[PDB]
């Protein structure tokens, strides 16, 4: 029942592939808003609570939670090869498969394996969008060794 | 009997449970908002009031009283590989209710030692300071 | 022998098992204390013993429609009396009631607050000021300080 | 035993509160006090907030006149029913005007033996002693009290 | 040009007369309605003057306080001032006599004055000028007791 | 007879009115008249009073006003209210500081007391808003002959 | 290709650029507000939303995506005497975008060593902490004369 | 062309009006006239005054305006109000710093007093908003 394709190249997705994914996850109701707002792969991966509520018209916190549940799954299994030269995806995944979801957040700030050692807690929260403290702490700890 | 597998519940099972606990009045809201097992387990005061239309603080308290019961006697085996449920339960039967909170952040027995008070509150949704402190204490001494 | 509990003023029954009270017993108590005007609200909101013991200023004002701060103060004055003389045996295995009562009879009113957070005699030594305020609902600083002091001087070995 | 000199305000009922309001020229407020069921206990514990919002006394000046009368009543009231350790005389010995704080202290369950441990925050928040000068004097004298 | 007026004992009628003398007859009605007597007049605040007595202008309030300060400077405080703080304050600076009622209303006297803090003189006694507070405090610490 | 430095502390409403005309603020004559602004009040005028009580809504207009008032304050005769001649003391430091005379004497400061003054007092009690000015006045005050 | 001299752009060149990036809808606002190269380079979230009428946060993100590209491949020679562009670019090509922010405060290579984190954020408009930290680090390991 | 050493501190309303025309802000002439903006007020103009009192609602328009004002401040003659020639001192540090002259002299600063100035004073009293500028001015002031 998992949305197809599996292991998708979400960074390179255009509006059309975003549209298809919305259908697969049962969010067809939001296709129009996503289309109007021209959400592509890059924007989907970087979507915030605020943008989802205000710009895409998803008023319910519960609906947003359902949406982020699906987005997290997509992010966890996505192919980041185009944008992830140092393979941060595998580094994160080795710590915990669930951490792979943070790949785009890290590479979008221009982080890579070599720079990761220097990263701060604030940076992981504000710049990389890692909201769960537990996750931040684990990633921080493992980054300080390498 | 056998404990219900709430993490795997679909909308229909949530609907059934609302009827059983005398909250039929809220079936429509829960249906509209597409509340399944996962969302039911993770429900907040805020979502209950704003998104599900449960305006009364007293009614919400009654609801959480029922939800805590359900959480206490749920089967978490699908999502709880390290059996945090039994660990929590051994400390105090009432702590079993926090199983889904902990496993949803990817915690297990081995990782538990490193958790902070802030994390148990903000990430795991353990609101009572007393409960946090006891869980924290026991986690550091299993280490 | 200052036992006004045998007096006519004091609501009947004495030494009631408030934790197990249902809507009907709550209704009876409201009548006795001269709060019949609020019977309908309490009925509609389905206030039982457990909810009565846990009632907050906010719930009383917003959910039960008691707009006056003075009326709420009168209400809490009555609820404090009830809480002081209630039977907590079903929910108080370690007898925190007597521990609190030995400190000061008026501290018995905090029993349900403490047992509701899963405190017992053994755990009491570790309790913090924040916990007594936020978790147990002990609003008077004087009371918190005395309870805290006595808790730290407990023999846990 | 008909008429006492110092009134037992803690034991006053609605009717005695009503009579007192008349005597002090606040008849206009009798209905509000009746509706709100103000007895001796509630009268002694009345706050600025309750007076303005619940009793409808909108003017700060009117409230000041009211508290001027209440402070007198509190200063000369008989607290014997509720003041086992006689904190009234302790306060009075410091300054007669401080007797007005008796009910505030005994309502928190303070007594002579517990006074040494009381904090400035407690005197302000729990006992309702708003004047710093008064708090400081009470605190100072309380440091030379014997505890258990 | 009243000689030692006993303002603490003044009734409504004397306050009314005073308002007339200082050219504030416009405010007689409000003062009457609010039942301002000597005690309330001496303890009047900016807030009460604006909100309860309807003196909307800050400039008018300033004029009023200018007159009140004069009255306070020349008043007889003997009913309420057993230790004669009035003369003590006046000897320091004639302009300090105006603070008598503020101090004696809190139960202060010559013997207690030394224990007061700058915050207390502001919050409890209504001495708004820091310069005045500091001078009163300093002199209080150096005074002769019994 | 015409004095060189005007005795602004002793000015009455009529002199204030004249001054408003001279500086091109005739538009405000009515407000000043209604509010009964005399010399004392003119010297003590605040931004707030000027905006709310005198109806000068524009911050630019208020700036023009204060530009004129500062000049007046700088060259005024303070002899009635300045027994210790703080005006000349301030003037000796910098002629522009003479504008603070009424601020200092209104708190009851004089040459002998000046040594004890604090930064907070110069700001809150004396109305010296410019840090640069406060610092210079404070410094010079500490190094005075007591 | 040729790198455009965006610092010297006039309204007309800004209008052309808006067309090329698919933001023709906003041409009128940018015209009305008289946005030239200097103002384009210094545009803030606030100005974009309030003054230029770009209500959607998503749309603003799309816009800044394009502006960042422009800034990355702009010619700054008129205003960048010490060639901070190449210094930034050597660290990471993506840092070239911060050139105008730095030169607008009157920073150059020689002054860069002394710069503070607060300055990079408030004065230079470098919003990403990661970027700030890297730029700060590299600035401290320069020539200190 | 571009005016040589204009004596902006001594400008009257009429000169301010002319300058608004030259920089293409004729639209605002009326507001500036009504508000009686002269040289002294122009040099001391704030964001707040520009928005609320002069009716310049757009942040972008205000930015354009300050861009022009900065230019004017950079090339102005301050001699009437600048006895110690702080203008040339600031200019020698960096031509762009000349713009701060009126801010400094308006607080009564001069060359001799400059050494004692604090960061807070440069920001709050003198209106130097850029930290980079403050730091450089502070540094150079301590070393002369």
UniProtKB/Swiss-Prot annotation, chain B:
Induction: Up-regulated by lipopolysaccharides (LPS). Changing residue 59 to A: Does not affect phosphorylation level. Predominantly expressed in brain, kidney and liver. Expressed at lower level in placenta. Residues 9-73, 83-143 form the SAM domain. Changing residue 128 to D: Slightly reduced ability to form an octameric ring and promote axonal degeneration following injury. It is found in: Cytoplasm; Cell projection, Axon; Cell projection, Dendrite; Synapse. Changing residue 116 to A: Does not affect phosphorylation level. Changing residue 99 to A: Does not affect phosphorylation level. It comes from the Eukaryota. Signal peptide: none annotated. The TIR domain mediates NAD(+) hydrolase (NADase) activity. Self-association of TIR domains is required for NADase activity. The ARM repeats inhibit the NAD(+) hydrolase (NADase) activity by binding to NAD(+): NAD(+)-binding to ARM repeats facilitates inhibition of the TIR domain NADase through their domain interface. In contrast to classical ARM repeats, the last helix of ARM 6 does not fold back to interact with the first two helices, but instead turns towards the N-terminus of SARM1. As a result, the two following motifs ARM 7 and ARM 8 reverse their directions and lie perpendicularly. Moreover, ARM repeats interact with different domains not only within each protomer but also of the adjacent ones. Homooctamer; forms an octameric ring via SAM domains. Interacts with TICAM1/TRIF and thereby interferes with TICAM1/TRIF function. Interacts with MAPK10/JNK3 and SDC2 (via cytoplasmic domain). Belongs to the SARM1 family. This is NAD(+) hydrolase SARM1. The gene is SARM1. The chain holds residues 404 to 546 of 724 of the full protein.
From Swiss-Prot, chain C:
It comes from the Eukaryota. Changing residue 116 to A: Does not affect phosphorylation level. The modification Phosphoserine is found at residue 157. Changing residue 149 to A: Does not affect phosphorylation level. Phosphorylation at Ser-157 by JNK kinases (MAPK8, MAPK9 and /or MAPK10) enhance the NAD(+) hydrolase (NADase) activity. Phosphorylation at Ser-157 and subsequent activation takes place in response to oxidative stress conditions and inhibits mitochondrial respiration. Belongs to the SARM1 family. Homooctamer; forms an octameric ring via SAM domains. Interacts with TICAM1/TRIF and thereby interferes with TICAM1/TRIF function. Interacts with MAPK10/JNK3 and SDC2 (via cytoplasmic domain). The TIR domain mediates NAD(+) hydrolase (NADase) activity. Self-association of TIR domains is required for NADase activity. This is NAD(+) hydrolase SARM1. It comes from Homo sapiens (Human). The chain holds residues 392 to 548 of 724 of the full protein.
Curated annotation (Swiss-Prot), chain F:
Changing residue 118 to A: Does not affect phosphorylation level. One of its GO terms (molecular function) is NAD+ nucleosidase activity. Belongs to the SARM1 family. It comes from Homo sapiens. The chain holds residues 402 to 547 of 724 of the full protein. This is NAD(+) hydrolase SARM1. The gene is SARM1. Changing residue 53 to K: Reduced ability to form an octameric ring and promote axonal degeneration following injury. Keywords: Cell projection, Cytoplasm, Differentiation, Hydrolase, Immunity, Innate immunity, Mitochondrion, NAD, Neurogenesis, Phosphoprotein, Repeat, Synapse, Transit peptide. Changing residue 139 to A: Does not affect phosphorylation level.
């Amino acid at each position: 029942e998992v949305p197809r394709p599996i292991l998708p190249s979400v960074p390179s997705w255009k509006e059309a592939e975003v549209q298809t994914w919305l259908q697969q996850i049962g969010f067809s109701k939001y296709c129009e808003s996503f289309r109007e707002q021209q959400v592509d792969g890059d924007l989907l991966l970087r979507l915030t609570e605020e943008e989802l509520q205000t710009d895409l018209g998803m008023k319910s916190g519960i609906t947003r939670k359902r949406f982020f549940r699906e987005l997290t799954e997509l992010k966890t299994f996505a192919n980041y090869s185009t944008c992830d030269r140092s393979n941060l995806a595998d580094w994160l995944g080795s710590l915990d498969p669930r951490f792979r979801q943070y790949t785009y957040g890290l590479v979008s700030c221009g982080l890579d394996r070599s720079l990761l050692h220097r990263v701060s807690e604030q940076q992981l929260l504000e710049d990389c969008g890692i909201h769960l403290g537990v996750h931040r702490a684990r990633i921080l700890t493992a980054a300080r060794e390498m």
